């Protein structure tokens, strides 16, 4: 076997960086441009910042603003039609989270129109095999990406999700050729968003990183950059919520710290916590980020035990264990005395996770979020049978069985604490 | 094959030639050529310059494979894709032995 470590070609980043890099895609050979944008980011003056700079040197451009909170396999098909009506050469994404995914699927059906969608949903479905091969991309196009919020590293990772209009099914893609050829990470575009979106995303990164250290695909390449995220998110995050734009230094480092952790979960797959929050955030209409925020404190007591159900030759001997690895966070981060044991280091981590959710102002249990006691015992069964097959359990050393994954969904509704 | 100054009117001589005047110099010494005045000699121009913030980077190759027993497997990926001819470079001690 053989691990890997893949990334893009280039990551520019500092304050005041978008007009300079964009001067690099006109001195070379580029003439025609296409843009993708969310609805809210066109009625205000954000998407005009990159349209005027391109226009003075002279390149034609056309906007495309209909992508909602999720793609539906019908709007994206409108882009392939608009694509081959103007013959673009560069695809400039923009936004955070959702709008980038839809701008990734319209690009693969622009280089290959004849490819029907039944071939790209069964040959590439999980990034651990390598038997097949994906066609060569980048003949008459190359992609760009930009980020607007802090908490979702979807610009340097090969993950893309779409759902069907007819049945209500999910189809994920994953293979290491959809990654763009130039990322950009600016902080001048995030100084104005309110103080309710900078504590979900800024709490999303903490969960996006604290599973890449415990999985069974982390090598000595990815273990490092993840421990640089957890450190930069205990000195500055509390000071980016009480002050906002008054302290423009601290706002920058949080934003240059999620996309760090993005590098970690693109070379080592994620745990279980980033599965149960998909369905719990696209069937009750919760935004992603609060869901894994309400479950991260409950899984840590679930991966640390004897675990009678655990596959052998991996996660038992080839990989050391899932327990002692949680300790090494409790001493590099500085939440332990010099003389301690294994167990007491766990608890002093877990308290640090509760005192952060307090001052940031999020609820405790699902009940305070706006879910009635009407649609939670009649839908727990069609919901807990989905977390077993939605791209997880490759990680999360404890091999889960379905009759115990519903205890966590049923003790995080009344406020109780899971325990054996 | 053309007169010096210009003609009158009643003819089709070349039209976009500047007049005889509006053509001066900058000296008297010797072997000095003339050039045409206009609104670029009466205009001195300046420059201003602010302080822009620099930008950093983080650049790498596309791919780094690694683990015990990974030289043959990866090197099969180069021949399935279209590649026919291959040059090699090497030191000396790495050729008189079996590396």
């Amino acid at each position: 076997n053989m691990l890997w470590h893949k990334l893009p070609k280039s990551i520019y980043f500092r304050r005041g960086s978008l007009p300079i890099a964009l001067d690099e895609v006109i001195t070379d050979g580029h003439k025609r441009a296409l843009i993708v944008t969310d609805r809210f980011l066109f009625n205000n003056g954000y998407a005009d910042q990159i349209t005027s700079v391109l226009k003075a040197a002279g390149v034609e451009t056309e906007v495309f603003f209909e992508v909602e909170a999720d793609p539906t396999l019908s709007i994206v098909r409108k882009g392939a039609e608009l694509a081959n009506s103007f013959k673009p050469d560069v695809i400039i994404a923009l936004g955070g989270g959702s709008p980038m995914d839809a701008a990734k699927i319209m690009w693969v059906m622009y280089e290959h129109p004849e490819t029907h969608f039944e071939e790209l949903a069964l040959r590439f479905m999980d990034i651990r095999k390598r038997i097949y091969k994906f066609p060569k991309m980048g003949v008459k196009a190359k992609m760009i990406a930009v980020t607007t919020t802090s908490g979702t590293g979807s610009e340097v990772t090969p993950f893309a999700v779409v759902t069907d209009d007819a049945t209500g099914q999910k189809y994920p893609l994953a293979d290491y050729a959809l990654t763009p050829d130039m990322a950009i990470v600016d902080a001048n575009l995030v100084m104005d968003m309110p103080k309710s979106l900078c504590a979900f995303g800024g709490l999303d990164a903490v969960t996006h990183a604290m599973e890449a250290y415990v999985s069974v695909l982390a090598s000595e390449f990815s273990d490092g950059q993840a421990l640089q995220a957890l450190k930069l998110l205990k000195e500055y995050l509390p000071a980016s919520y009480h002050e906002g734009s008054k302290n423009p230094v601290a706002r920058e480092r949080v934003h240059s710290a999620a996309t760090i952790a993005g590098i970690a979960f693109a070379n080592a797959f994620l745990g279980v916590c980033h599965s149960m929050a998909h369905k719990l955030g696209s069937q009750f209409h919760i935004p992603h980020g609060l869901a894994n925020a309400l479950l991260i404190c409950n899984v840590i007591r679930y991966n640390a035990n004897d675990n009678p159900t655990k596959q052998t030759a991996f996660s038992q001997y080839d990989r050391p264990q899932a327990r002692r690895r949680y300790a090494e966070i409790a001493d590099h981060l500085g939440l332990s005395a010099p003389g301690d044991r294994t167990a007491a280091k766990i608890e002093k981590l877990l308290a640090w996770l509760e005192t952060l959710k307090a001052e940031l102002g999020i609820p405790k249990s699902i009940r305070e979020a706006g879910v009635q006691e009407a649609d939670f015992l009649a839908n727990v069964d069609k919901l807990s049978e989905d977390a077993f097959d939605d791209q997880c359990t490759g990680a999360n050393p404890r091999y889960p069985l379905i009759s115990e994954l519903k205890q966590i969904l049923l003790d995080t509704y009344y406020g109780r604490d899971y325990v054996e | 094959n053309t007169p010096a100054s210009q003609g009158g009117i009643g003819d089709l001589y070349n039209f976009k030639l500047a007049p005889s005047l509006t053509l001066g110099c900058g000296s008297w010494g010797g072997n000095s050529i003339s050039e045409n005045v206009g609104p670029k000699h009466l205009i001195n121009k300046k420059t201003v310059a602010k302080r822009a913030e620099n930008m950093l980077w983080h650049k790498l190759p596309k791919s780094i494979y690694f683990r015990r027993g990974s030289l043959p497997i990866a090197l099969d990926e180069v021949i399935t894709d279209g590649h026919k001819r291959a040059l090699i470079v090497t030191d000396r001690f790495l050729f008189n032995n079996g590396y």
């Binding site: - | 094959n1 053309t2 007169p3 010096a4 100054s5 210009q6 003609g7 009158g8 005889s20 005047l21 509006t22 053509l23 001066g24 110099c25 900058g26 000296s27 008297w28 003339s34 005045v37 000699h41």
Partner: protein
């Protein structure tokens, strides 16, 4: 113009220098004698660079 250049100030000058005409053997004669004769009786020969 000769006193202007020497005054302790910048200057430019619109001068005039005697410009020649050259006729070789291969040329036409019936035409290049009646053009020189036109551009000299134009305002009695005071145009600069005649």
């Amino acid at each position: 113009v000769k006193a202007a250049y020497s005054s302790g100030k910048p200057a430019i000058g619109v001068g005039a220098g005697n410009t020649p005409v050259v006729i070789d053997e291969t040329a036409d004669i019936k035409r290049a004698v009646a053009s020189v004769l036109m551009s000299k009786t134009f305002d009695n020969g005071v145009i600069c660079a005649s």
